[PDB]
Amino acid sequence: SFLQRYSSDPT
Amino acid sequence: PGTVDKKMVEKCWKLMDKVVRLCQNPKLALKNSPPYILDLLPDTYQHLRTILSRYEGKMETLGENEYFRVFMENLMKKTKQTISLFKEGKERMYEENSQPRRNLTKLSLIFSHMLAELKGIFPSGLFQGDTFRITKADAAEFWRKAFGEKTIVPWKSFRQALHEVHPISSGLEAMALKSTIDLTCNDYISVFEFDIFTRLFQPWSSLLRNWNSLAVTHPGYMAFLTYDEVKARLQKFIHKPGSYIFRLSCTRLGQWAIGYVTADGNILQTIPHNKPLFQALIDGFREGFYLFPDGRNQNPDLTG
């Protein structure tokens, strides 16, 4: 099912 | 491979029916996060139905399809391996972190990959392997030039052909290479698999040399791991800011999924965009985010 897991590149 | 007749699918389904239930057992406490076997199969079944619905009649045109012959074959084999794992893993399955259980996660990825592949070689349910849109230009040339229109080739061939432009060190290096590319674990390399590799390891110019530096000799590279597994794993360095590992993404195939530990002891995961993994790594390290590849105190010097 759906995610959320991923984060923005710290830059 | 032999011919894929209407009966063939029947069996695969019965096999899929079981593999599901087995995974539906509470003791497993499987999470929804992808890869999520409890879905990949239903969906796969679904797609296979769509396909079979469109070749509705011209079934022989399909059974004949080289790639499709492979899939079902691989699929059937793969559903089985799973069934065995259970009986010949018995109560050890419900044991988190148990070899038997790790194999399960593995397959999950494969199923996810397989589906991804299938949906690519059958968008809409109509075969399109021979015209697959390879992403990076360069690569696209090599493939259509080396194998022409072939949708899938025996590992053996792919290797020899590739070695002409990109020299393979040893019989071992190649075994490593093969494991990295053969995402459906079936000793065959498909245009789809080929594309994904070439995307992850671009630029094509130095294909294998990049791979060598980003996976063969880099402690951060993690073969077949999932989002959960990456977090579960980085937890031993849980508050060792800098510690990071990378792997292939499950939902965004063809792209990277870095996993790292924040100064404030937290585990995040980014998927490089608008910048090649090569670059992300260089900067992240500079900014104190990509310092310790999997705990390791020392870090690879990609600047070479």
UniProtKB/Swiss-Prot annotation, chain A:
It is found in: Cell membrane; Endoplasmic reticulum membrane; Golgi apparatus membrane; Nucleus membrane. Phosphorylated on Tyr residues in response to EGF. Dephosphorylation by PTPRJ prevents endocytosis and stabilizes the receptor at the plasma membrane. Dephosphorylated by PTPN1 and PTPN2. Monoubiquitinated and polyubiquitinated upon EGF stimulation; which does not affect tyrosine kinase activity or signaling capacity but may play a role in lysosomal targeting. Polyubiquitin linkage is mainly through 'Lys-63', but linkage through 'Lys-48', 'Lys-11' and 'Lys-29' also occurs. Deubiquitination by OTUD7B prevents degradation. Ubiquitinated by RNF115 and RNF126. Ubiquitinated by ZNRF1 or CBL at different lysines in response to EGF stimulation; leading to recruitment of the ESCRT machinery and subsequent degradation in the lysosomes. The modification Phosphoserine is found at S1, S7, S8. Belongs to the protein kinase superfamily. Tyr protein kinase family. EGF receptor subfamily. Receptor tyrosine kinase binding ligands of the EGF family and activating several signaling cascades to convert extracellular cues into appropriate cellular responses. Known ligands include EGF, TGFA/TGF-alpha, AREG, epigen/EPGN, BTC/betacellulin, epiregulin/EREG and HBEGF/heparin-binding EGF. Ligand binding triggers receptor homo- and/or heterodimerization and autophosphorylation on key cytoplasmic residues. The phosphorylated receptor recruits adapter proteins like GRB2 which in turn activates complex downstream signaling cascades. It is linked to Lung cancer: A common malignancy affecting tissues of the lung. The most common form of lung cancer is non-small cell lung cancer (NSCLC) that can be divided into 3 major histologic subtypes: squamous cell carcinoma, adenocarcinoma, and large cell lung cancer. NSCLC is often diagnosed at an advanced stage and has a poor prognosis. This is Epidermal growth factor receptor. It comes from Homo sapiens. The lineage of its organism: Eukaryota, Metazoa, Chordata, Craniata, Vertebrata. The chain holds residues 1064 to 1074 of 1210 of the full protein.
From Swiss-Prot, chain B:
GO terms for molecular function: cadherin binding; calcium ion binding; ephrin receptor binding; phosphatidylinositol 3-kinase regulatory subunit binding; phosphotyrosine residue binding; receptor tyrosine kinase binding; SH3 domain binding; ubiquitin protein ligase activity. One of its GO terms (biological process) is protein ubiquitination. It is found in: Cytoplasm; Cell membrane; Cell projection, Cilium; Golgi apparatus. Its main location: cytoplasm. Changing P35A: Abolishes interaction with ZAP70. Residues 1-304 form the Cbl-PTB domain. Keywords: Calcium, Cell membrane, Cell projection, Cytoplasm, Disease variant, Golgi apparatus, Membrane, Metal-binding, Phosphoprotein, Proto-oncogene, Repeat, Transferase, Ubl conjugation, Ubl conjugation pathway, Zinc, Zinc-finger. Changing G259E: Abolishes interaction with ZAP70 and EPHB1, but does not affect interaction with SLA. Reduces ubiquitination and therefore proteasomal degradation of SPRED2. Changing S33D: Abolishes interaction with ZAP70. GO terms for cellular component: cilium; cytosol; flotillin complex; focal adhesion; Golgi apparatus; growth cone; membrane raft; perinuclear region of cytoplasm. Changing R247K: Abolishes interaction with ZAP70. Residues 129-201 are annotated as: EF-hand-like. Ca(2+) binds at D182, T184, N186, Y188, E193. Residues 1-304 are annotated as: Sufficient for interaction with EPHB1. Forms homodimers; IFT20 promotes the formation of stable homodimers. Associates with NCK via its SH3 domain. The phosphorylated C-terminus interacts with CD2AP via its second SH3 domain. Binds to UBE2L3. Interacts with adapters SLA, SLA2 and with the phosphorylated C-terminus of SH2B2. Interacts with EGFR, SYK and ZAP70 via the highly conserved Cbl-N region. Also interacts with SORBS1 and INPPL1/SHIP2. Interacts with phosphorylated LAT2. Interacts with CBLB. Interacts with ALK, AXL, BLK, FGR and FGFR2. (Microbial infection) Interacts with M.tuberculosis LpqN, which influences the balance between intrinsic antibacterial and antiviral defense. This protein has one functional calcium-binding site. This is E3 ubiquitin-protein ligase CBL. It comes from Homo sapiens. The lineage of its organism: Eukaryota, Metazoa, Chordata, Craniata, Vertebrata. The gene is CBL.
